[PDB]
Design a protein around this motif. Sequence first.
Motif, mmCIF file in Angstrom:
data_model
loop_
_atom_site.group_PDB
_atom_site.id
_atom_site.type_symbol
_atom_site.label_atom_id
_atom_site.label_comp_id
_atom_site.label_asym_id
_atom_site.label_seq_id
_atom_site.Cartn_x
_atom_site.Cartn_y
_atom_site.Cartn_z
ATOM 1 N N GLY A 27 1.599 10.451 -1.601
ATOM 2 C CA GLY A 27 1.929 9.087 -1.186
ATOM 3 C C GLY A 27 0.731 8.162 -1.029
ATOM 4 O O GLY A 27 0.885 7.045 -0.533
ATOM 5 N N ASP A 30 -5.343 6.270 -2.863
ATOM 6 C CA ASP A 30 -6.737 6.613 -2.743
ATOM 7 C C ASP A 30 -6.992 7.861 -1.902
ATOM 8 O O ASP A 30 -6.074 8.473 -1.301
ATOM 9 C CB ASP A 30 -7.491 5.436 -2.116
ATOM 10 N N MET A 46 -10.628 -2.411 3.165
ATOM 11 C CA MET A 46 -9.514 -2.260 4.089
ATOM 12 C C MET A 46 -8.400 -1.576 3.299
ATOM 13 O O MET A 46 -8.198 -1.873 2.137
ATOM 14 C CB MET A 46 -9.000 -3.619 4.538
ATOM 15 N N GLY A 48 -4.285 0.293 3.947
ATOM 16 C CA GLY A 48 -3.253 0.436 4.956
ATOM 17 C C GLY A 48 -2.242 1.484 4.611
ATOM 18 O O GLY A 48 -2.292 2.082 3.537
ATOM 19 N N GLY B 27 2.534 15.161 2.436
ATOM 20 C CA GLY B 27 1.657 14.462 3.357
ATOM 21 C C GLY B 27 2.474 13.626 4.330
ATOM 22 O O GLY B 27 1.930 13.019 5.262
ATOM 23 N N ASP B 29 5.226 14.358 6.738
ATOM 24 C CA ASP B 29 5.910 15.520 7.266
ATOM 25 C C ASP B 29 7.358 15.104 7.457
ATOM 26 O O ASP B 29 8.250 15.941 7.484
ATOM 27 C CB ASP B 29 5.324 15.938 8.621
ATOM 28 N N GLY B 48 3.410 8.379 13.549
ATOM 29 C CA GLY B 48 2.091 7.848 13.273
ATOM 30 C C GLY B 48 1.705 8.002 11.828
ATOM 31 O O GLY B 48 2.177 8.898 11.123
HETATM 32 C C1 LIG Z 1 -6.363 1.059 -4.816
HETATM 33 C C2 LIG Z 1 -5.902 0.026 -3.799
HETATM 34 C C3 LIG Z 1 -6.578 0.343 -2.477
HETATM 35 C C4 LIG Z 1 -6.497 -0.827 -1.513
HETATM 36 C C5 LIG Z 1 -5.468 -0.675 -0.377
HETATM 37 N N1 LIG Z 1 -4.377 0.244 -0.749
HETATM 38 C C6 LIG Z 1 -3.662 0.883 0.176
HETATM 39 O O1 LIG Z 1 -3.927 0.814 1.375
HETATM 40 C C7 LIG Z 1 -2.541 1.824 -0.304
HETATM 41 C C8 LIG Z 1 -1.269 1.045 -0.651
HETATM 42 N N2 LIG Z 1 -2.287 2.747 0.801
HETATM 43 C C9 LIG Z 1 -1.753 3.948 0.638
HETATM 44 O O2 LIG Z 1 -1.457 4.393 -0.453
HETATM 45 C C10 LIG Z 1 -1.589 4.780 1.904
HETATM 46 C C11 LIG Z 1 -2.826 5.648 2.141
HETATM 47 C C12 LIG Z 1 -4.166 4.918 2.119
HETATM 48 C C13 LIG Z 1 -4.697 4.695 0.708
HETATM 49 O O3 LIG Z 1 -4.154 5.289 -0.212
HETATM 50 O O4 LIG Z 1 -5.657 3.929 0.522
HETATM 51 N N3 LIG Z 1 -0.386 5.613 1.921
HETATM 52 C C14 LIG Z 1 0.104 6.108 3.060
HETATM 53 O O5 LIG Z 1 -0.385 5.868 4.174
HETATM 54 C C15 LIG Z 1 1.353 6.971 2.942
HETATM 55 C C16 LIG Z 1 2.576 6.083 3.120
HETATM 56 C C17 LIG Z 1 2.480 4.766 2.409
HETATM 57 C C18 LIG Z 1 2.497 4.706 1.020
HETATM 58 C C19 LIG Z 1 2.443 3.498 0.357
HETATM 59 C C20 LIG Z 1 2.372 2.315 1.090
HETATM 60 C C21 LIG Z 1 2.351 2.362 2.487
HETATM 61 C C22 LIG Z 1 2.405 3.581 3.136
HETATM 62 N N4 LIG Z 1 1.266 7.925 4.041
HETATM 63 C C23 LIG Z 1 0.280 8.811 4.111
HETATM 64 C C24 LIG Z 1 0.266 9.708 5.354
HETATM 65 C C25 LIG Z 1 -0.679 10.899 5.188
HETATM 66 C C26 LIG Z 1 -1.156 11.481 6.511
HETATM 67 C C27 LIG Z 1 -2.184 12.536 6.227
HETATM 68 C C28 LIG Z 1 -1.758 10.403 7.373
HETATM 69 N N5 LIG Z 1 1.530 10.144 5.935
HETATM 70 C C29 LIG Z 1 2.180 9.398 6.826
HETATM 71 O O6 LIG Z 1 1.759 8.298 7.213
HETATM 72 C C30 LIG Z 1 3.465 9.989 7.405
HETATM 73 N N6 LIG Z 1 3.087 10.475 8.727
HETATM 74 C C31 LIG Z 1 3.294 11.732 9.087
HETATM 75 O O7 LIG Z 1 3.819 12.559 8.360
HETATM 76 C C32 LIG Z 1 2.824 12.116 10.456
HETATM 77 N N7 LIG Z 1 3.722 13.164 11.020
HETATM 78 C C33 LIG Z 1 1.364 12.602 10.358
HETATM 79 C C34 LIG Z 1 0.609 12.688 11.685
HETATM 80 C C35 LIG Z 1 0.325 11.287 12.272
HETATM 81 N N8 LIG Z 1 0.073 11.292 13.717
HETATM 82 C C36 LIG Z 1 -1.046 11.738 14.291
HETATM 83 N N9 LIG Z 1 -2.043 12.225 13.550
HETATM 84 N N10 LIG Z 1 -1.171 11.707 15.615
HETATM 85 C C37 LIG Z 1 4.603 8.920 7.510
HETATM 86 C C38 LIG Z 1 4.893 8.339 6.172
HETATM 87 C C39 LIG Z 1 5.881 9.602 8.098
HETATM 88 C C40 LIG Z 1 -4.964 -2.060 0.046
HETATM 89 N N11 LIG Z 1 -5.603 -2.685 0.929
HETATM 90 O O8 LIG Z 1 -3.939 -2.510 -0.521
#
Ligand SMILES: CCCC[C@H](NC(=O)[C@H](C)NC(=O)[C@H](CCC(=O)O)NC(=O)[C@H](Cc1ccccc1)NC[C@H](CC(C)C)NC(=O)[C@@H](NC(=O)[C@@H](N)CCCNC(N)=[NH2+])C(C)C)C(N)=O
Lengths: 99, 99
Positions: A27, A30, A46, A48, B27, B29, B48
């Motif tokens: 999911g 990066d 940044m 999110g 990732g 859960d 979270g």
């Molecule tokens: C290439 C572009 C980069 C630029 C940047 N892009 C982003 O931020 C992109 C969209 N983000 C993502 O792809 C992010 C991860 C960060 C990243 O990849 O950079 N993805 C994510 O965060 C995805 C969900 C998501 C996907 C798409 C959009 C929004 C959200 N979740 C990843 C995450 C992994 C875990 C190890 C923390 N899992 C979760 O967040 C799940 N959480 C859980 O399963 C919890 N039980 C885990 C424990 C938390 N609590 C704690 N530690 N006390 C939730 C979905 C139920 C931007 N600014 O637009």
Amino acid sequence: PQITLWKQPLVTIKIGGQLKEALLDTGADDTVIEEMSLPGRWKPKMIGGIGGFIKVRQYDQIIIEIAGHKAIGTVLVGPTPVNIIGRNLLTQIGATLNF
Amino acid sequence: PQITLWKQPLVTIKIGGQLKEALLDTGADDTVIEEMSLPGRWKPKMIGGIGGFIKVRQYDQIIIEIAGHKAIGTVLVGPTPVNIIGRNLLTQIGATLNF
Ligand SMILES: CCCC[C@H](NC(=O)[C@H](C)NC(=O)[C@H](CCC(=O)O)NC(=O)[C@H](Cc1ccccc1)NC[C@H](CC(C)C)NC(=O)[C@@H](NC(=O)[C@@H](N)CCCNC(N)=[NH2+])C(C)C)C(N)=O
């Protein structure tokens, strides 16, 4: 290898010469690691997910070994609760979930 | 139905009677769907992620259909930025990571 999901998909990685454990995250676009010292100049960014946005330092062209599989690409270092290997790197090592 | 990770692994799911698109997230859960009126008794929860926690309602024994596959489980409903299928449901469809 073929990894089932009854347990979190954690594997060991080696970056900057040290070992670390990270989660194979489909999911995430990066790869982000908890704050550490990485050789190289970095650029603030940044990113999110749930909860919101967090600041991180983007390091380009990092050589990383994930479960004995080499990749070399972008790694983001900042305050992520867990270290995650996103698609940017999973694509490099040929990871597919399937059908 | 397994999380074809490369380009965002998005697929159609059926929940509460509506057709939807969701991201397959190793990732995650947990599974967390966009705000919707599901009948059924819930429990308030806080999950979270990357930048913090989010308040959601927890529904148990929910029947969902992931890429034509039937699964039953705990679904959380709240202000998520995208629908996410987590390992709790991925395991029931037999999804695996392969590299
Ligand atoms: C290439 C572009 C980069 C630029 C940047 N892009 C982003 O931020 C992109 C969209 N983000 C993502 O792809 C992010 C991860 C960060 C990243 O990849 O950079 N993805 C994510 O965060 C995805 C969900 C998501 C996907 C798409 C959009 C929004 C959200 N979740 C990843 C995450 C992994 C875990 C190890 C923390 N899992 C979760 O967040 C799940 N959480 C859980 O399963 C919890 N039980 C885990 C424990 C938390 N609590 C704690 N530690 N006390 C939730 C979905 C139920 C931007 N600014 O637009």
